[PDB]
C-alpha cells in the first residue's frame, strides 16, 4: 500500500548548486515508455 | 489528506520499514508523478484516499483526484532546476542547462543528472518555479551515467 509525505514548495533558489551537462541524444520510445540509445 | 500545493514524497511499508519509491507534484488539487512509480495504483494521504484519474504507460505519467494540470515548457534555452527530493534526503535544487533528446517525433529537453531511483517524478522548474515536467524516465548513455527526459503531460 503507498502514501504520500509533503517534503516542501516548489520554488526556484536563488544560488542553487549549478550542475551536469547538456548531451543531445538520439533516442527512442517504445509502446512501454521505455527510452533507448539510438545507433 | 494534506492537499496543500507542494512536492510529496511517494512511500511504501510493503517492503522493509518504510520505501520512497518516487516522488510527485501536488498542483490545483491533483497529484501528479510518473506512471511507474505508482503502477496506476491508488494512493493514501493521512487518512484519505487519492484514485487515479488518468494515466498513460508510454508518456510514464499519471494524475490523482483530476485531469493533468502541468502546462509550462522549457523554453529551449534557459537553465532550470531539478527540485531534488532523494529517498531519506532533505529536498535540494540542483540547477542545470538541459540537453536534448532527439526523436523520430521532435525533440524534448533532458537533464543529465544522478539520483537514486526513488527519486523519479523530482518536478523540474523554470525561473518562474512553474514545473515544465518531472525527472525520472531515461536512458544510460555510454559511461554509465543516467539521462532523464523532461516529461510533461498535456492539460485538456
Ligand atoms: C531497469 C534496467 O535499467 C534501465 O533500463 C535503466 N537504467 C537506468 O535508467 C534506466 C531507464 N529507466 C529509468 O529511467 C528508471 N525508471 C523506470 C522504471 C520503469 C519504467 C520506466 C522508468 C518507464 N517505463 C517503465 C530509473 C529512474 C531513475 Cl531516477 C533511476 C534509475 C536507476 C535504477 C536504474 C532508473
Not at chain 2, 508518456?59 to 490523482?64: A, E
Not at chain 2, 483530476?66 to 522549457?74: F, R, V
Not at chain 2, 532523494?86 to 540547477?95: D, L, M, T, W
Not at chain 2, 540537453?99 to 523554470?126: C, E, H, N, Q, R
Request: hydrophobic residues 35%; proline residues 4%.
Amino acid at each position: 500500500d503507498m502514501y504520500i509525505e509533503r517534503a516542501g514548495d516548489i520554488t526556484w533558489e536563488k544560488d542553487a548548486e549549478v550542475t551536469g551537462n547538456s548531451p543531445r541524444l538520439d533516442v527512442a520510445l517504445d509502446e512501454s515508455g521505455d527510452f533507448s540509445l539510438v545507433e | 489528506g494534506e492537499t496543500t500545493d507542494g512536492v510529496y514524497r511517494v512511500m511504501t511499508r510493503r517492503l522493509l520499514g518504510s520505501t520512497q519509491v518516487g516522488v510527485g507534484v501536488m498542483q490545483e488539487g491533483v497529484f501528479h508523478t510518473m506512471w511507474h512509480v505508482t503502477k496506476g495504483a491508488a494512493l493514501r494521504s493521512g487518512e484519505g484516499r487519492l484514485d487515479p484519474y488518468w494515466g498513460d504507460v508510454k508518456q510514464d505519467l499519471v494524475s490523482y483526484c483530476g485531469p493533468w494540470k502541468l502546462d509550462a515548457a522549457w523554453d529551449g534555452l534557459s537553465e532550470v532546476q531539478l527540485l531534488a527530493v532523494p529517498p531519506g534526503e532533505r529536498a535540494k535544487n540542483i540547477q542545470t542547462l538541459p540537453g536534448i533528446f532527439k526523436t523520430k517525433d521532435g525533440d524534448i529537453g533532458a537533464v543529465a543528472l544522478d539520483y537514486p531511483a526513488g527519486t523519479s517524478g523530482s518536478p523540474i522548474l523554470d525561473k518562474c518555479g512553474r514545473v515544465i515536467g518531472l525527472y525520472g524516465n531515461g536512458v544510460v548513455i555510454k559511461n554509465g551515467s543516467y539521462v532523464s527526459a523532461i516529461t510533461q503531460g498535456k492539460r485538456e
